[PDB]
Design an enzyme around this catalytic site. Structure first.
Site, PDB file in Angstrom:
ATOM      1  N   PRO A  92       0.825  -1.226   0.000  1.00  0.00           N
ATOM      2  CA  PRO A  92       0.000   0.000   0.000  1.00  0.00           C
ATOM      3  C   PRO A  92       0.863   1.282   0.000  1.00  0.00           C
ATOM      4  O   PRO A  92       0.382   2.374  -0.321  1.00  0.00           O
ATOM      5  CB  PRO A  92      -0.836  -0.115   1.282  1.00  0.00           C
ATOM      6  CG  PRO A  92      -0.562  -1.448   1.856  1.00  0.00           C
ATOM      7  CD  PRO A  92       0.730  -1.935   1.293  1.00  0.00           C
ATOM      8  N   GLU A 119       2.436  -8.868   8.686  1.00  0.00           N
ATOM      9  CA  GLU A 119       2.317  -7.429   8.838  1.00  0.00           C
ATOM     10  C   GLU A 119       3.173  -6.680   7.850  1.00  0.00           C
ATOM     11  O   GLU A 119       3.101  -5.487   7.725  1.00  0.00           O
ATOM     12  CB  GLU A 119       2.595  -7.007  10.263  1.00  0.00           C
ATOM     13  CG  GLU A 119       1.616  -7.595  11.246  1.00  0.00           C
ATOM     14  CD  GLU A 119       0.508  -6.644  11.600  1.00  0.00           C
ATOM     15  OE1 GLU A 119       0.742  -5.427  11.529  1.00  0.00           O
ATOM     16  OE2 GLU A 119      -0.586  -7.103  11.952  1.00  0.00           O
ATOM     17  N   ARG A 157      -4.201  -8.377 -20.619  1.00  0.00           N
ATOM     18  CA  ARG A 157      -5.171  -7.790 -21.567  1.00  0.00           C
ATOM     19  C   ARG A 157      -4.489  -7.004 -22.690  1.00  0.00           C
ATOM     20  O   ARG A 157      -5.037  -6.906 -23.784  1.00  0.00           O
ATOM     21  CB  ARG A 157      -6.090  -6.821 -20.825  1.00  0.00           C
ATOM     22  CG  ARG A 157      -7.142  -7.454 -19.923  1.00  0.00           C
ATOM     23  CD  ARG A 157      -8.098  -6.393 -19.425  1.00  0.00           C
ATOM     24  NE  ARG A 157      -9.041  -5.943 -20.456  1.00  0.00           N
ATOM     25  CZ  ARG A 157      -8.973  -4.782 -21.109  1.00  0.00           C
ATOM     26  NH1 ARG A 157      -7.978  -3.932 -20.871  1.00  0.00           N
ATOM     27  NH2 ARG A 157      -9.911  -4.454 -21.988  1.00  0.00           N
ATOM     28  N   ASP A 164     -13.111   1.929 -24.403  1.00  0.00           N
ATOM     29  CA  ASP A 164     -12.526   1.400 -23.170  1.00  0.00           C
ATOM     30  C   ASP A 164     -12.266   2.520 -22.139  1.00  0.00           C
ATOM     31  O   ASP A 164     -12.093   3.689 -22.518  1.00  0.00           O
ATOM     32  CB  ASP A 164     -11.228   0.623 -23.489  1.00  0.00           C
ATOM     33  CG  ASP A 164     -10.788  -0.390 -22.440  1.00  0.00           C
ATOM     34  OD1 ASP A 164     -11.529  -1.371 -22.213  1.00  0.00           O
ATOM     35  OD2 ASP A 164      -9.682  -0.220 -21.875  1.00  0.00           O
TER      36      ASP A 164
HETATM   37  C1  LIG Z   1     -13.099  -5.592 -19.510  1.00  0.00           C
HETATM   38  S1  LIG Z   1     -14.074  -5.034 -18.119  1.00  0.00           S
HETATM   39  C2  LIG Z   1     -15.267  -3.817 -18.787  1.00  0.00           C
HETATM   40  C3  LIG Z   1     -14.662  -2.422 -18.851  1.00  0.00           C
HETATM   41  C4  LIG Z   1     -15.579  -1.539 -19.714  1.00  0.00           C
HETATM   42  N1  LIG Z   1     -14.837  -0.400 -20.265  1.00  0.00           N
HETATM   43  C5  LIG Z   1     -16.857  -1.032 -18.980  1.00  0.00           C
HETATM   44  O1  LIG Z   1     -17.659  -0.378 -19.684  1.00  0.00           O
HETATM   45  O2  LIG Z   1     -17.020  -1.287 -17.755  1.00  0.00           O
HETATM   46  C6  LIG Z   1     -15.062  -6.465 -17.506  1.00  0.00           C
HETATM   47  C7  LIG Z   1     -15.447  -6.343 -16.019  1.00  0.00           C
HETATM   48  O3  LIG Z   1     -14.277  -6.174 -15.195  1.00  0.00           O
HETATM   49  C8  LIG Z   1     -14.679  -5.598 -13.952  1.00  0.00           C
HETATM   50  N2  LIG Z   1     -13.667  -4.545 -13.633  1.00  0.00           N
HETATM   51  C9  LIG Z   1     -12.682  -4.222 -14.487  1.00  0.00           C
HETATM   52  N3  LIG Z   1     -11.903  -3.295 -13.916  1.00  0.00           N
HETATM   53  C10 LIG Z   1     -12.382  -3.059 -12.683  1.00  0.00           C
HETATM   54  C11 LIG Z   1     -12.018  -2.196 -11.731  1.00  0.00           C
HETATM   55  N4  LIG Z   1     -10.919  -1.464 -11.954  1.00  0.00           N
HETATM   56  N5  LIG Z   1     -12.719  -2.058 -10.594  1.00  0.00           N
HETATM   57  C12 LIG Z   1     -13.806  -2.881 -10.345  1.00  0.00           C
HETATM   58  N6  LIG Z   1     -14.168  -3.765 -11.362  1.00  0.00           N
HETATM   59  C13 LIG Z   1     -13.478  -3.821 -12.512  1.00  0.00           C
HETATM   60  C14 LIG Z   1     -16.099  -5.106 -14.172  1.00  0.00           C
HETATM   61  O4  LIG Z   1     -17.059  -6.061 -13.531  1.00  0.00           O
HETATM   62  C15 LIG Z   1     -16.273  -5.122 -15.682  1.00  0.00           C
HETATM   63  O5  LIG Z   1     -17.647  -5.348 -16.045  1.00  0.00           O
HETATM   64  C1  LIG Z   2      -1.527  -6.578   6.505  1.00  0.00           C
HETATM   65  S1  LIG Z   2      -0.762  -6.181   4.948  1.00  0.00           S
HETATM   66  C2  LIG Z   2      -0.071  -4.466   4.938  1.00  0.00           C
HETATM   67  C3  LIG Z   2       0.344  -3.905   6.319  1.00  0.00           C
HETATM   68  C4  LIG Z   2       1.050  -2.517   6.208  1.00  0.00           C
HETATM   69  N1  LIG Z   2       0.460  -1.569   5.238  1.00  0.00           N
HETATM   70  C5  LIG Z   2       2.568  -2.605   5.962  1.00  0.00           C
HETATM   71  O1  LIG Z   2       2.976  -3.218   4.947  1.00  0.00           O
HETATM   72  O2  LIG Z   2       3.291  -1.973   6.760  1.00  0.00           O
HETATM   73  C6  LIG Z   2       0.468  -7.449   4.444  1.00  0.00           C
HETATM   74  C7  LIG Z   2       0.634  -7.508   2.912  1.00  0.00           C
HETATM   75  O3  LIG Z   2      -0.544  -7.158   2.173  1.00  0.00           O
HETATM   76  C8  LIG Z   2      -0.154  -6.586   0.886  1.00  0.00           C
HETATM   77  N2  LIG Z   2      -1.070  -5.430   0.522  1.00  0.00           N
HETATM   78  C9  LIG Z   2      -2.021  -5.001   1.364  1.00  0.00           C
HETATM   79  N3  LIG Z   2      -2.729  -4.048   0.765  1.00  0.00           N
HETATM   80  C10 LIG Z   2      -2.228  -3.855  -0.470  1.00  0.00           C
HETATM   81  C11 LIG Z   2      -2.578  -3.002  -1.455  1.00  0.00           C
HETATM   82  N4  LIG Z   2      -3.638  -2.177  -1.234  1.00  0.00           N
HETATM   83  N5  LIG Z   2      -1.922  -2.971  -2.632  1.00  0.00           N
HETATM   84  C12 LIG Z   2      -0.868  -3.876  -2.845  1.00  0.00           C
HETATM   85  N6  LIG Z   2      -0.509  -4.749  -1.790  1.00  0.00           N
HETATM   86  C13 LIG Z   2      -1.197  -4.719  -0.620  1.00  0.00           C
HETATM   87  C14 LIG Z   2       1.346  -6.269   0.984  1.00  0.00           C
HETATM   88  O4  LIG Z   2       2.077  -7.205   0.125  1.00  0.00           O
HETATM   89  C15 LIG Z   2       1.692  -6.539   2.448  1.00  0.00           C
HETATM   90  O5  LIG Z   2       2.941  -7.200   2.532  1.00  0.00           O
END
Ligand SMILES: C[S@@+](CC[C@H](N)C(=O)[O-])C[C@H]1O[C@@H](n2cnc3c(N)ncnc32)[C@H](O)[C@@H]1O
Ligand SMILES: C[S@@+](CC[C@H](N)C(=O)[O-])C[C@H]1O[C@@H](n2cnc3c(N)ncnc32)[C@H](O)[C@@H]1O
Lengths: 240, 238
Positions: A92, A119, A157, A164
């Site tokens: 994060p 953690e 993809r 898109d």
């Molecule tokens: C190829 S995507 C469709 C993107 C398209 N441009 C649209 O009109 O939503 C297929 C599915 O992926 C999911 N999805 C893709 N990206 C996402 C995102 N960033 N956050 C939440 N859902 C996502 C959605 O359920 C979407 O219907």
């Molecule tokens: C309990 S969590 C993160 C705890 C805290 N933020 C830290 O790293 O100090 C343990 C693992 O979750 C993953 N993670 C959690 N949230 C994420 C996010 N939003 N995006 C990418 N990786 C995430 C990381 O790989 C991290 O090592």
């Protein structure tokens, strides 16, 4: 074979969710993607040493040791061969993933993803080995396996022959399919009885208006043309 | 029991990543979380279990057919019983998921999550049935399954007994050994002073946020102490 991905994770079998289903599965079969997993617990000094250990300075939770991760990485690096391998830690604290970032990662020959648990991982591993830190968003997950999978899915993809929103920096327009009437709602007539120029202008206008309504921040960082400023002003006034 | 989750998806087997691993798997076992899948392929009318349909107005791709979705949704709602269920559609067009959003979602008793495929789902289905649209971030995925799983994982962590709170990035983490390949654990952590450990952590957290995510600090109300530790971090580095 065009993209080689290696994942460092204590739950490699969790990755069946992408290796066995969807675009990622199809890309493996077609040889566009190569996916491999590397369990750190197979790289402890002896089989009696765990991947985690108590945090220095105390506090709740455990921390992942450097040597298991270091062992796993070195082994994944060797398997990548003669490819320029970027080492990503999913965290994060990392750079926020966006469609622009996805396009960049798609140009890489090989990627090695470090999925953390507990953690977090020991800072000294990050300093020495992690090239780039990446975040899927501003929320806390229990582990880096779903983030690693989110990245693999987004990048696959973009691989040629794999198929898109944010392609133009705008939200997409609404979508409609059969039948022409459902639950008293009819398909916009332009989609049924329009020419390609009518359909193109309605789609751009819908995309601009939906971006203006929901994600105005996407507009503050995008230059609106003469046409777009006019399609948008009209959408706003005709909203409902 | 604490939280009931219904997932509308054509790949229910992908949800083994949350049903079999981590806090989510544990919450299921402990009865804090109920996880169910509703496959629109089952709610089909033909031999080939068709779930997609061509888009109106031309263009590439397919759209998900309304009827198989409506069927799966109907059954998910019936199984939710008397619980107040919020129907969420995962899409890049939705409200961006953040820790504050997670906390809000963690107050719900039931969630029905709709996972899209192809180019998306019919807008008439969304206007009629979907309560809220949620995105996991500004990128495009092939389906809503991974985003649905990210949402459930994040929310489960907030369930009592399950296992950006401060509004800051976190402090670095260190574990045994004390010294590894010419790198050593900051001495402050090797000491027993719980006040000096706390102060050093809060400073590294403030410092890392200032360096990487200053946007999180602009929205934050820094305490007298926090303004001092952060100033100290800034002045004392090359
Ligand atoms: C190829 S995507 C469709 C993107 C398209 N441009 C649209 O009109 O939503 C297929 C599915 O992926 C999911 N999805 C893709 N990206 C996402 C995102 N960033 N956050 C939440 N859902 C996502 C959605 O359920 C979407 O219907
Ligand atoms: C309990 S969590 C993160 C705890 C805290 N933020 C830290 O790293 O100090 C343990 C693992 O979750 C993953 N993670 C959690 N949230 C994420 C996010 N939003 N995006 C990418 N990786 C995430 C990381 O790989 C991290 O090592």
């Amino acid at each position: 074979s065009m993209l080689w991905v290696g994942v460092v994770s204590i739950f490699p079998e969790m990755f069946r969710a992408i290796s066995d289903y969807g675009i990622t599965s199809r890309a493996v079969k077609q040889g566009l993607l190569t996916l491999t997993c590397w369990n750190p617990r197979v790289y402890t000094e002896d089989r009696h040493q765990t991947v985690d250990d108590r945090p220095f300075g105390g506090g709740p939770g455990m921390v992942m040791k450097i040597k298991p991760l270091e062992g796993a990485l070195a082994d994944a690096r060797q398997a990548a061969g003669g490819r320029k391998a970027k080492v990503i830690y999913l965290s994060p604290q990392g750079r926020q993933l966006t469609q622009a970032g996805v396009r960049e990662l798609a140009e890489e020959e090989a990627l090695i993803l470090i999925a953390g648990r507990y953690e977090g991982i020991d800072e000294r591993f990050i300093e020495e080995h992690v090239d780039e830190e990446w975040s899927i968003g501003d929320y806390v997950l229990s582990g880096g396996e779903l983030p690693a999978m989110v990245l693999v899915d987004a990048v696959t993809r973009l691989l040629p022959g794999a198929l898109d929103s944010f392609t133009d920096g705008l939200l997409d327009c609404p979508h409609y399919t059969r039948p022409e009437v459902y639950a008293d709602k009819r398909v916009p007539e332009v989609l049924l009885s329009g020419n390609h120029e009518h359909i193109r202008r309605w789609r751009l206008q819908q995309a601009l208006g939906r971006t203006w309504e929901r994600r105005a921040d996407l507009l503050d960082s995008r230059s609106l043309s003469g046409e777009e400023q006019k399609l948008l002003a009209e959408y706003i006034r005709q909203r409902d």
